[PDB]
Design a protein around this ligand. Structure first.
Ligand SMILES: CCCCCCCCCCCCCCCCCC(=O)OC[C@H](COP(=O)(O)OCCN)OC(=O)CCCCCCCCCCCCCCCCC
Ligand SMILES: CCCCc1oc2ccccc2c1C(=O)c1cc(I)c(OCCN(CC)CC)c(I)c1
Ligand SMILES: [Ca+2]
Lengths: 48, 100, 820, 284, 49
C-alpha cells in the first residue's frame, strides 16, 4: 500500500501513514504541482 | 450661439440689477454667465474630438484665449452668486431671508 | 537607593533589548552572565528593605507585591534551566516571563501609577459590555462558519488564509473584518464561494455589511465610553512697511513663491519649465531681500526664519540637501497671519499636554516588541518555492505554473527571502508593531507568524495558530484601548476649556430679527401663491422627485428613459414658471432653495436640448437631474440643522485645516525632491497611478497614505535600490540607485502628524457644536423660538419692526407650554 | 390567573434552575464551536455525534418552554422563537428521507443575554444610544444613493475592456498586478505587454464585482469606497478605463464627505450623548 | 446696498465683462489649432477653418 496525502488541509494524516507502513507500503505528501513528478516516481525505490 | 445668448441674458440681468434696488437680480444673472462659460468648455471639447479624428496638432493663440474666457466666466459667476447670497447664518438668530 | 534601583533596572532593560538574531557568542555570554548578577542584586535589594520596614507592611502596596513573584520566577527558571529542558518554544516563553521584570520601570513614576486607579474600575464596570462584544464576535464567527465553512473549495492554486473552515480561523476572520483591513477581499471570497456576482450569490455581502457597521459601532461605542468615563475621573479626582499694503504684498509673494516651488520638474535636470521657475525664484528672492533691510534699519525669533530662508535661497544661486531646506517658504506666513500663529500655539500646547499617555504607549509597544523578538526571531525567512525549507536547499531554479496549469510553466531562480517586516531585533519588531497598530498589512504578518517553524527554516502551513493570540491582544490593548484614551484625552482637555442657558436665551432674544414672508396682493396671483404654498403641492413635488430618483436608478449597462427625462424636465420647468408667477420674481430669488431649483432647472433644460441636438444630428450635464433630490434637504429639519451646525463649525476654523494643507504641501514637495526619479513600473507601488513625479500625484499619494491604504508598501517601494527613471539624468552603469532609506523617516512621521492634526480638526469642530450636541431638547431650545418667529412672520408679512398688540394676542394661543 | 390545576411547577422556578440552564447553553455553544463544516456533503464521526447531542439540548429547551408556558412576555419571546425553530428544523430534516435552517442555530448564544441581567441592561443602553444617530444614518444613506447614481451615469459599462494575449482568452498581466481595465484609441491606458491586444467581453476588475453597471453594484462599490478599504483600487481602475484627468474629483470628494465628514458627525453625536449621560447620572 | 456698492462685487463684474469680451474674441479667432501632417499651414476654428 502506497498512500498519498494531496494538497493543503487540516485533516489527520496518521491513519494513512499507518496504512502505508503497515502493509509494507510507503507514505508520500503532494502539496503542490511542482511536487507531483518527484513524488509519483519514488514508489519504484520500495519495489526494488 | 446658445452660450452667446446666455451671455446676453446675463448682461441684461446685471444691467437691470443696478437700478430700482433690484439687488436680487444679481443672483440669476451669475448663473447665466456660469452656464455660458460652461458651454464654452464642452464647446472646445467638440473641437478636441475633431483634433482626435484627423500628423501633429498644436494650440498656440486662441486656445488659451478660450480657456481663459471659460475660467473667468465660471469663476466670476460662482463668486458673484456667492457674494449675492446673503450669508451662512453662523448664529442661532441669524438665518437666510432675514430683514436686510 | 532611588537612583541605584533605576540604574539596575535600566541595565536590565538594556540587556533585554540587546538580544537579536545571529548575535555574536560573546553577546550571548554577556546576556546570560548578566542575568545572574542582576537577579542577585534584585534579591539583595529585596531582603534589605524587608528588614528595613518589616515583613507585614511590605505587601501593603501592590508595587512591591510582584517583586516577590519576579524573584521567585527568576530563581525557578534558573533552577529549571540546568535540567533537561526540551521544547525551544518552551524556552522562548519562559524567557518571556523574565520580560515581565520590565514592569519595574512603570513603578518608578507617580503618574504611571495614579491613572490605573480609575481605569481599573472602568474596565471592571464595562466588562459586561466587553463580554457583549465578545459574544457578538462569537455569534458572527459561528454564522460565518455556517455560511462559508467548507465552501472555499476553489479549483485554483490561490491561497485564502482568511476563511471559516473552523472556529479559530472564523474568529480570526471576523476580527480582521472588524478591524476593517482587507475585509473586501474576504467579501469577494464569500461571493465567489457562492454562484458569483449574480442575484443569489451577491446577497452574502449583506453579512459583511452587518458585520462591519454594527460591528464597529458597538466597538467604537464601548471603547469611546471607556475613554470618557475614565477621563471624567481624570478631571474630577485631579481637581480634588508696517502698513497693511506691504504685509499683503509680502504674503501674496510668499504664496506665489510656494506655488512656484510646488510646480517643478523633479525628473529632468534641465527641462523647459525649470529655468522659467528659476527666473521666478530669483525675482522673488530679489523682492524678499529688500523686506529685511527695511526691517533691520527700523528695528533691532520669527525674522530669523525669514533671514535663513533668504540666505539658503540666495547662496544656492551633500549640497543638494540645501535644495530641500527651501520648503520653509510657507512657514513664514505663520508670522504674517495672526490666526495661523494662534492655531500653531494651540497645537503646540496640545502636544505639550499629551505627554503622560505617549510614554506609556511607547513603553508598551517596546515591551510587546521584546516579546515578539523572543517569539519570532529568525522565523520570518522563506524560499521562493515552499518545498525548500533551508537556505542551502533554496538554490538553483524551479518551475512556476501560470493560473495553476501543469502544462504552462516558467523557470524562476529560487532565493532565500527575508520578510520586509520582521522581529529580528527590537527596532524591526517595533517597526512591525507600528505597522500592525495602523491596521495596514497586519493579516499578512499574522499568517507569516502562524507558519513560523524554526529559527532558520521556512514556514509550515498553519503550524502555530495560537500565535494569533499575540496579534490579537496587542490590537485590543494598543490599537483599541490606548488609542481611544488618547482621543478621549483631547476631548475632555478641550471640554475643560469649553446660569448660561438663560444667558443664551436673553442674548438670542435681544439679537434676533424678523424674517420676510411675502404674502402677495392681487388675488389673481394670490390664488397661485396659495396653491403653490400649500403642503399638498410640496408633497406632490416631493413624490415626483422620488419617482425621478427611482427612474434614474433603473438605468443599467446594456429608450424609455429619454421620454421620462423630458417629462420630468418639463414638469420642473412648469414648477419654476408657476413659482416665478406666484412670487413675482422678487421673493423667488430671495430664497436660496429657489435659487438652487432655478440652477437645477436651467441645467436640466440645457442637458435636454444638448441630447436632442445630438440625436437630431457633455457627460457631466447629466449630473443636474441627480442633484434634484438634494432639495429634499429643504424638508428634513433635523438633517438640515445638523448639516448647517457642522458646516458653520467647519467655516469657523479656516486655520485648523490650513495646518493640514500646509503639512500636505511641505511633505509633497519633500517627497517630490526625494522620491521623484523612481521609475513607474507595473506591479509595484510606484506606477502610473501612484508616484511623486508631479505635485498633484504626490498630494494624491499623501492623501491615500492618510486614509490608511497600503502605505507601508509605498514605504518599501521608495527605499534604496530602485530602478531610476529612463528620462532622468544619471551616470551610466548605476540604474538601481534611486530611492533612499529616509522613506522610513518620511512616512512614519507623516502618518503620525497626519493622524494628529486630523484629530485636532475633528475635536475643535466638535467643540463649537458642544451646545448643540449636548442639548436637552425638552427643557428649552432655540427651535421653539425659531418656530415662534415663523408664526410672527406668518402674521407679519413684512418685518416693519413690531405690529398691533391684538396680533400678538393671537400668537399667544399658538405659543406652546414649552415657551408659553 | 387559572387555578392550581397545572401550575404546580412554579416552585421549582425559584430554585437555581437558571444556573443549570446557563451551563446547558454554554455546553451548546461549545458543541456549536467544535462542529467542523465539511465541503460537498461530507462528515466525520464527531459531526455525526453532535447531530445527536443537539437532540438533548432541544428537548431540554422544549420542556423548559412547556413548564414556563403553563405556569404563567419580554425577553422570553426570543427563547420561544429559538426553541420553535429548532424543533421545526429537527422534525423537517427527518421527513425528506434544505440545510439553510441550521443557520438559525447560531441565535442560541443570545440566550446568555437572557440569563444575565447586566447584559440585558447593557444591551438596552446600547439600543437607546443609537436613536440620535438616525439623522446621520439618513444623511449617509442619501449620500450613498446620490454618489451611486452619479457613478452609474459616469462609469457604466466602462470597465469591461482589458487586454488579453493575441488570439487567446488569457488575461495578460505581470507579477504583482491585478487585472485592470484597458482602453484602445482613447484617453485610457494601453498595456505594454508584447503579445497583448485590448478588447471587450471582460466581466470586470474584481471578478466582475467592482463596477458601476447597475444600481446594486454601484451602491456596493460606493459603500466599499466609503469604508476607505480599496477605494484607491476603484479610482485607479476608473483611471485606466476612461482617463486620469477627471475621475479623482468623484473619489477624493467621496472620501472627504462620505468618510471623514460622516465620521466627524458620528463621533460628535456619540461624544455629546456620553457627556449628557454622564451629566444626568452625576445629579443622582 | 451692502452687496452692490461693495468693491468685491464690482471687481467680479469687471472680470465678467473682460471674460465675455475675451470669449467673443475667442469665437472670431479661429487660430487655436494648427494641424501639420508632415506648405500646409492649417488653422482650425468653430465657425470656419
Ligand atoms: C433610529 C435608528 C436609526 C439607525 C441607526 C443605526 C446605527 C448607526 C450606526 C452608524 C455607523 C457607525 C460607524 C462607526 C465607524 C467607526 C470608525 C471606523 O473605524 O470606521 C470609519 C470608517 C473609516 O475606517 P478607518 O478604520 O477609520 O480607516 C483607517 C483610518 N486611517 O469610515 C466609515 O465607515 C464612515 C462612514 C460610516 C457609514 C456607515 C454606513 C451604514 C449606516 C446605515 C445606512 C442606512 C442603512 C439603511 C438600510 C439600507
Ligand atoms: C509629533 C507626533 C504627534 C502625534 C502622535 O504621536 C504618537 C506616538 C505614539 C503613538 C501615537 C502617536 C500620535 C497620534 O496622534 C496617533 C496615531 C495613531 I496610528 C492613531 O490611530 C489611528 C486610528 N486607527 C488606525 C486605522 C487605530 C486606532 C491615533 I487615534 C493617534
Ligand atoms: Ca486598509
Amino acid at each position: 500500500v502506497f498512500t498519498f496525502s494531496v494538497g493543503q488541509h487540516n485533516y489527520d494524516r496518521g491513519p494513512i501513514q499507518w496504512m502505508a507502513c503497515e502493509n509494507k507500503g510507503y507514505y508520500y505528501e503532494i502539496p503542490s504541482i511542482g511536487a507531483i513528478r518527484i513524488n509519483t516516481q519514488e514508489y519504484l525505490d520500495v519495489l526494488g | 450661439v446658445f452660450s452667446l445668448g446666455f451671455l446676453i441674458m446675463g448682461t441684461i440681468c446685471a444691467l437691470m440689477a443696478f437700478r430700482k434696488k433690484r439687488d436680487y437680480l444679481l443672483r440669476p444673472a451669475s448663473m447665466f454667465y456660469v452656464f455660458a462659460g460652461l458651454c464654452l468648455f464642452v464647446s472646445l471639447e467638440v473641437m478636441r474630438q475633431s483634433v482626435k479624428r484627423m500628423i501633429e496638432y498644436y494650440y498656440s493663440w486662441s486656445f488659451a484665449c478660450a480657456c481663459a474666457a471659460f475660467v473667468l466666466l465660471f469663476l466670476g459667476g460662482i463668486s458673484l452668486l456667492l457674494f449675492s447670497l446673503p450669508r451662512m447664518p453662523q448664529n442661532p438668530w441669524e438665518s437666510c431671508m432675514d430683514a436686510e | 537607593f532611588y537612583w541605584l534601583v533605576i540604574l539596575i533596572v535600566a541595565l536590565n532593560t538594556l540587556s533585554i533589548a540587546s538580544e537579536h538574531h545571529n548575535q555574536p557568542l560573546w553577546l550571548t555570554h554577556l546576556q546570560d552572565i548578566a542575568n545572574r548578577v542582576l537577579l542577585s542584586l534584585f534579591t539583595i535589594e529585596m531582603l534589605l528593605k524587608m528588614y528595613g520596614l518589616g515583613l507585614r507592611q511590605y505587601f501593603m502596596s501592590i508595587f512591591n507585591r510582584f517583586d516577590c513573584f519576579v524573584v521567585c520566577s527568576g530563581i525557578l527558571e534558573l533552577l529549571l534551566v540546568e535540567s533537561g529542558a526540551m521544547t525551544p518554544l518552551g524556552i522562548s516563553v519562559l524567557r518571556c516571563i523574565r520580560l515581565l521584570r520590565l514592569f519595574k520601570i512603570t513603578k518608578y513614576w507617580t503618574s504611571l501609577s495614579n491613572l490605573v486607579a480609575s481605569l481599573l474600575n472602568s474596565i471592571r464596570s464595562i466588562a459586561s459590555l466587553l463580554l457583549l462584544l465578545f459574544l457578538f464576535i462569537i455569534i458572527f464567527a459561528l454564522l460565518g462558519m455556517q455560511l462559508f465553512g467548507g465552501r472555499y473549495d476553489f479549483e485554483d492554486t490561490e491561497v485564502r488564509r482568511s476563511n471559516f473552515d473552523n472556529f479559530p480561523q472564523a474568529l480570526i476572520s471576523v476580527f480582521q473584518v472588524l478591524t476593517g483591513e482587507d475585509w473586501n477581499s474576504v467579501m469577494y471570497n464569500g461571493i465567489m464561494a457562492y454562484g458569483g456576482p449574480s442575484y443569489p450569490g451577491v446577497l452574502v455581502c449583506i453579512y459583511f455589511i452587518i458585520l462591519f457597521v454594527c460591528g464597529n459601532y458597538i466597538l467604537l461605542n464601548v471603547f469611546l465610553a471607556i475613554a470618557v468615563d475614565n477621563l471624567a475621573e481624570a478631571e474630577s479626582l485631579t481637581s480634588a512697511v508696517n502698513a497693511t499694503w506691504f504685509t499683503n504684498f509680502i504674503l501674496l509673494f510668499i504664496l506665489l513663491s510656494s506655488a512656484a516651488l510646488a510646480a517643478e520638474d523633479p525628473i529632468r535636470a534641465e527641462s523647459v519649465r525649470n529655468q522659467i521657475l528659476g527666473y521666478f525664484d530669483i525675482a522673488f528672492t530679489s523682492v524678499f531681500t529688500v523686506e529685511i533691510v527695511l526691517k533691520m534699519t527700523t528695528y533691532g525669533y520669527f525674522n530669523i526664519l525669514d533671514l535663513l530662508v533668504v540666505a539658503v535661497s540666495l547662496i544656492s544661486m551633500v549640497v543638494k540637501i540645501l535644495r530641500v531646506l527651501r520648503v520653509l517658504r510657507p512657514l513664514r506666513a505663520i508670522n504674517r497671519a495672526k490666526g495661523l500663529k494662534h492655531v500653531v500655539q494651540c497645537v503646540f500646547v496640545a502636544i505639550r499636554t499629551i505627554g503622560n499617555i505617549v510614554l506609556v504607549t511607547t513603553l508598551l509597544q517596546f515591551m510587546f516588541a521584546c516579546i515578539g523578538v523572543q517569539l519570532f526571531k529568525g522565523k520570518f525567512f522563506s524560499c521562493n518555492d515552499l518545498s525548500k525549507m533551508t537556505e542551502e536547499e533554496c538554490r538553483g531554479y524551479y518551475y512556476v505554473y501560470k493560473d495553476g496549469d501543469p502544462t504552462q510553466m516558467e523557470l524562476r531562480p529560487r532565493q532565500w527571502i527575508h520578510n520586509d517586516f520582521h522581529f529580528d531585533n527590537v527596532l524591526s519588531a517595533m517597526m512591525s508593531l507600528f505597522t500592525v497598530s495602523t491596521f495596514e498589512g497586519w493579516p499578512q504578518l499574522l499568517y507569516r507568524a502562524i507558519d513560523s517553524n524554526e529559527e532558520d527554516m521556512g514556514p509550515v502551513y498553519n503550524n502555530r495558530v495560537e500565535m494569533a493570540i499575540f496579534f490579537i491582544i496587542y490590537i485590543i490593548l494598543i490599537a483599541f484601548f490606548m488609542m481611544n484614551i488618547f482621543v478621549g484625552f483631547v476631548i475632555v482637555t478641550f471640554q475643560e476649556q469649553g446660569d448660561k442657558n438663560q444667558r443664551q436665551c436673553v442674548q438670542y432674544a435681544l439679537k434676533a430679527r424678523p424674517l420676510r414672508c411675502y404674502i402677495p396682493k392681487n388675488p389673481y396671483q394670490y390664488q397661485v401663491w396659495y396653491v403653490v404654498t400649500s403642503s399638498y403641492f410640496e408633497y406632490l413635488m416631493f413624490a415626483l422627485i422620488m419617482l425621478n430618483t427611482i427612474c434614474l436608478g433603473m438605468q443599467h449597462y446594456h429608450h424609455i428613459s429619454d421620454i421620462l427625462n423630458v417629462a420630468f424636465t418639463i414638469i420642473f420647468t412648469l414648477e419654476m414658471i408657476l413659482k416665478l408667477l406666484a412670487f413675482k420674481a422678487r421673493g423667488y430669488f430671495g430664497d436660496p432653495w429657489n435659487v438652487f431649483d432655478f440652477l437645477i432647472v436651467i441645467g436640466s433644460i440645457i442637458d435636454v436640448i444638448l441630447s436632442e441636438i445630438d440625436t437630431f444630428l457633455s457627460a457631466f450635464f447629466r449630473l443636474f437631474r441627480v442633484m434634484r433630490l438634494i432639495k429634499l434637504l429643504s424638508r428634513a429639519e433635523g438633517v438640515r440643522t445638523l448639516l448647517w451646525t457642522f458646516i458653520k463649525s467647519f467655516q469657523a476654523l479656516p486655520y485648523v485645516a490650513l495646518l493640514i494643507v500646509m503639512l500636505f504641501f511641505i511633505y509633497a514637495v519633500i517627497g517630490m525632491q526625494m522620491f521623484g526619479k523612481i521609475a513607474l513600473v507595473d506591479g509595484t507601488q510606484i506606477n502610473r497611478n501612484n508616484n511623486f513625479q508631479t505635485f498633484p500625484q504626490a498630494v494624491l499619494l499623501l492623501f491615500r497614505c492618510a486614509t490608511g491604504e497600503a502605505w507601508q508598501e509605498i514605504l518599501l517601494a521608495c527605499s534604496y535600490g530602485k530602478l531610476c527613471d529612463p528620462e532622468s539624468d544619471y551616470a551610466p552603469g548605476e540604474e538601481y540607485t534611486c530611492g533612499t532609506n529616509f522613506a522610513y523617516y518620511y512616512f512614519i512621521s507623516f502618518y503620525m502628524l497626519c493622524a494628529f492634526l486630523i484629530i485636532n480638526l475633528f475635536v475643535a469642530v466638535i467643540m463649537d457644536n458642544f451646545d448643540y450636541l449636548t442639548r436637552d431638547w425638552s427643557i428649552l431650545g432655540p427651535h421653539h423660538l425659531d418656530e415662534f418667529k415663523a408664526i410672527w412672520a406668518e402674521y407679519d408679512p413684512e418685518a416693519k419692526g413690531r405690529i398691533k398688540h391684538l396680533d400678538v394676542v393671537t400668537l399667544l394661543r399658538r405659543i406652546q407650554p414649552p415657551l408659553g | 390567573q387559572n387555578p392550581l390545576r397545572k401550575a404546580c411547577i412554579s416552585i421549582v422556578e425559584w430554585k437555581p434552575f437558571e444556573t443549570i440552564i446557563l451551563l446547558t447553553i454554554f455546553a451548546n455553544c461549545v458543541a456549536l464551536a467544535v462542529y467542523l463544516p465539511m465541503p460537498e456533503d461530507d462528515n466525520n464521526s464527531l459531526n455525526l455525534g453532535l447531530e445527536k447531542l443537539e437532540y438533548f439540548f432541544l428537548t431540554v429547551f422544549s420542556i423548559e418552554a412547556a413548564m414556563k408556558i403553563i405556569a404563567y412576555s419580554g425577553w422570553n419571546v426570543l427563547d420561544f422563537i429559538i426553541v420553535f425553530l429548532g424543533v421545526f428544523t429537527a422534525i423537517l430534516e427527518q421527513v425528506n428521507v434544505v440545510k439553510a435552517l441550521r443557520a438559525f442555530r447560531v441565535l442560541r448564544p443570545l440566550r446568555l443575554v437572557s440569563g444575565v441581567p447586566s447584559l440585558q441592561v447593557v444591551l438596552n443602553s446600547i439600543f437607546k444610544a443609537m436613536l440620535p444617530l438616525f439623522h446621520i444614518a439618513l444623511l449617509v444613506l442619501f449620500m450613498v444613493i446620490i454618489y451611486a447614481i452619479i457613478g452609474l451615469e459616469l462609469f457604466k459599462g466602462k470597465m469591461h475592456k482589458t487586454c488579453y494575449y493575441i488570439g487567446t482568452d488569457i488575461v495578460a498581466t505581470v507579477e504583482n498586478e491585478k487585472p485592470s481595465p484597458c482602453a484602445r484609441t482613447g484617453s485610457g491606458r494601453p498595456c505594454t505587454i508584447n503579445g497583448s491586444e485590448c478588447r471587450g467581453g471582460w466581466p470586470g476588475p474584481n471578478h466582475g464585482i467592482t463596477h458601476f453597471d447597475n444600481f446594486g453594484f454601484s451602491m456596493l462599490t460606493v459603500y466599499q469606497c466609503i469604508t476607505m478599504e480599496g477605494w484607491t483600487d476603484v479610482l485607479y481602475w476608473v483611471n485606466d478605463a476612461i482617463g486620469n484627468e477627471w475621475p479623482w474629483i468623484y473619489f477624493v470628494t467621496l472620501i472627504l464627505l462620505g468618510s471623514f465628514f460622516i465620521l466627524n458627525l458620528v463621533l460628535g453625536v456619540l461624544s455629546g450623548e456620553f457627556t449628557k449621560e454622564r451629566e444626568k447620572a452625576k445629579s443622582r | 446696498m451692502s452687496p452692490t456698492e461693495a468693491p468685491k462685487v464690482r471687481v467680479t463684474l469687471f472680470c465678467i465683462l473682460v471674460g465675455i469680451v475675451l470669449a467673443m474674441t475667442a469665437v472670431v479667432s479661429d487660430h487655436w489649432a494648427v494641424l501639420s501632417p508632415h506648405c500646409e499651414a492649417a488653422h482650425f476654428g468653430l465657425w470656419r477653418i
